[PDB]
Write a protein that binds this ligand. Structure first.
Ligand SMILES: CCCCCCCC/C=C\CCCCCCCC(=O)OC[C@H](O)CO
Ligand SMILES: CCCCCCCC/C=C\CCCCCCCC(=O)OC[C@H](O)CO
Ligand SMILES: CCCCCCCC/C=C\CCCCCCCC(=O)OC[C@H](O)CO
Ligand SMILES: CCCCCCCC/C=C\CCCCCCCC(=O)OC[C@H](O)CO
Ligand SMILES: CCCCCCCC/C=C\CCCCCCCC(=O)OC[C@H](O)CO
Ligand SMILES: CCCCCCCC/C=C\CCCCCCCC(=O)OC[C@H](O)CO
Ligand SMILES: CCCCCCCC/C=C\CCCCCCCC(=O)OC[C@H](O)CO
Ligand SMILES: CCCCCCCC/C=C\CCCCCCCC(=O)OC[C@H](O)CO
Ligand SMILES: CCCCCCCC/C=C\CCCCCCCC(=O)OC[C@H](O)CO
Ligand SMILES: CCCCCCCC/C=C\CCCCCCCC(=O)OC[C@H](O)CO
Ligand SMILES: CCCCCCCC/C=C\CCCCCCCC(=O)OC[C@H](O)CO
Ligand SMILES: CCCCCCCC/C=C\CCCCCCCC(=O)OC[C@H](O)CO
Ligand SMILES: CCCCCCCC/C=C\CCCCCCCC(=O)OC[C@H](O)CO
Ligand SMILES: CCCCCCCC/C=C\CCCCCCCC(=O)OC[C@H](O)CO
Ligand SMILES: CCCCCCCC/C=C\CCCCCCCC(=O)OC[C@H](O)CO
Ligand SMILES: CCCCCCCC/C=C\CCCCCCCC(=O)OC[C@H](O)CO
Ligand SMILES: [K+]
Ligand SMILES: [K+]
Ligand SMILES: [K+]
Lengths: 91, 91, 91, 91
């Protein structure tokens, strides 16, 4: 679907903005939103520097969701390119 | 195959649950199952924070399997999206 | 497009060369261009060792761009292979 | 090509075996082949724990090659799955 990419992008961007909020109050290593927002991208982009790591179960559970959405993001981006640069081959 | 995604998912989820078990008794850095379960996801999602790292050969051998299944997981997810959002183009 | 891969590659390679320049003068952990060039690849390849990590907001903003281009690079490489080894199936 | 996957796999596996050899004698953090072989996989699988990091230019140049082959490995695996589970859709 044409709105399929937009629907997955709006929910992914929403998480990378909302998930850092509880992470400030539940994690000791996370002491502010800019720090939490940074970690969320580092995790959702499947880069994982390790400079900010969740310790608490809830924090490690929320991190797991961000990783699962992180790999889904790559799959959504790769599909938006693989299906885009393949239709130009016949005509 | 329709059951092809399910067959790869049930064996992948099984490993992320079973592989953390020997990792507790063989690794010094891993001292419990929740810690081991956390590392398994961090590795299988190809994020790799480095907060928990295998030292022993067996632990580094089991980690290699988890990484090889980790990249295969992305390939399985990307294929389940690339082939899903391409069939809607003609009809 | 045939020049589509070249257009994305020339802008990606340009960033991995230009982005390390401000990173030397804005980050304390980055004290030279070879160090900065190394970090840029580690980030753009979505490997993320964590040996060099941005602290400053601007440095963490520039890093985010490099990560977003990093995942786009994998998507560009995977599409240049998935569409290349699929056209040889019928003829 | 049918032998296309085999040709890319035999050269990739060869590097993950040969590249760790100079890395022992050129890097201070790498003091043995099993340690070097471990780092090569961690890098070629684009996991990057950061437990073993190259310092020297040559070591950081060889690491860059391993990362470039690492992302190419994912692209080779994803293509071997995306084109495999798509031909079963019509017949
Ligand atoms: C892009 C901007 C995102 C907001 C974060 C910010 O710029 O960082 C502020 C920091 O707290 C300042 O000391
Ligand atoms: C939209 C982006 C909002 C940017 C404002 C972030 C902020 O709080 O400002 C930082 C300031 O430089 C420090 O006090
Ligand atoms: C599914 C996600 C499950 C991820 C595991 C969460 C629990 C956790 O790892 O617990 C941390 C604690 O500090 C150690 O006992
Ligand atoms: C389903 C996901 C929600 C699972 C919530 C996990 C909560 C948990 O196990 O955390 C323990 C806490 O520290 C003590 O009550
Ligand atoms: C999702 C839940 C997975 C189980 C792990 C757990 O919640 O962590 C318990 C920890 O040991 C409590 O101190
Ligand atoms: C299914 C998930 C099972 C969740 C139970 C995990 C656990 O052992 O409980 C932790 C408790 O909060 C500490 O004693
Ligand atoms: C194939 C997987 C092979 C991975 C390498 C396992 C051996 C290992 O790295 O050994 C650790 C030891 O501490 C150092 O001599
Ligand atoms: C095939 C995979 C199985 C390979 C098992 C490796 C065992 C090993 O080399 O570990 C040494 C141990 O510490 C001493 O006996
Ligand atoms: C490939 C070459 C890229 C340039 C970087 C370099 O070789 O490193 C020099 C270092 O500063 C020497 O001490
Ligand atoms: C084109 C690549 C340029 C390589 C030259 C990098 C450099 O500055 O040279 C390092 C020298 O070994 C130390 O003084
Ligand atoms: C979109 C990119 C936004 C990435 C976040 C940049 C801001 C940052 O994380 O700020 C660092 C500071 O040290 C902590 O307050
Ligand atoms: C749009 C991207 C550009 C956003 C620039 C962010 C600048 C910023 O928030 O940094 C604060 C600085 O430390 C104090 O003025
Ligand atoms: C799979 C086996 C790869 C060889 C590495 C090995 O088993 O590790 C030996 C270590 O040096 C023992 O102390
Ligand atoms: C083929 C795999 C070769 C496995 C042998 C690795 C090794 O050197 O053996 C380790 C031994 O346990 C320690 O002395
Ligand atoms: C293309 C690969 C280029 C990667 C950069 C290699 C040079 C390097 O980073 O140099 C290290 C030294 O310790 C710092 O001056
Ligand atoms: C082309 C790849 C080969 C580039 C080789 C780089 C060598 C280099 O710059 O390293 C400096 C050394 O430390 C001093 O001579
Ligand atoms: K990765
Ligand atoms: K990583
Ligand atoms: K990492």
């Amino acid at each position: 679907r044409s709105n399929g990419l937009n629907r997955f992008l709006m929910i992914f961007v929403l998480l990378v903005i909302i998930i850092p909020v509880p992470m400030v109050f539940i994690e000791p290593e996370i002491n502010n939103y800019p720090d939490a927002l940074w970690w969320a991208i580092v995790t959702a982009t499947t880069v994982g520097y390790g400079d900010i790591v969740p310790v608490t179960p809830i924090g490690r559970i929320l991190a797991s969701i961000m990783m699962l959405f992180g790999i889904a993001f790559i799959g959504m981006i790769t599909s938006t390119i693989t299906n885009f640069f393949r239709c130009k081959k016949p005509t």
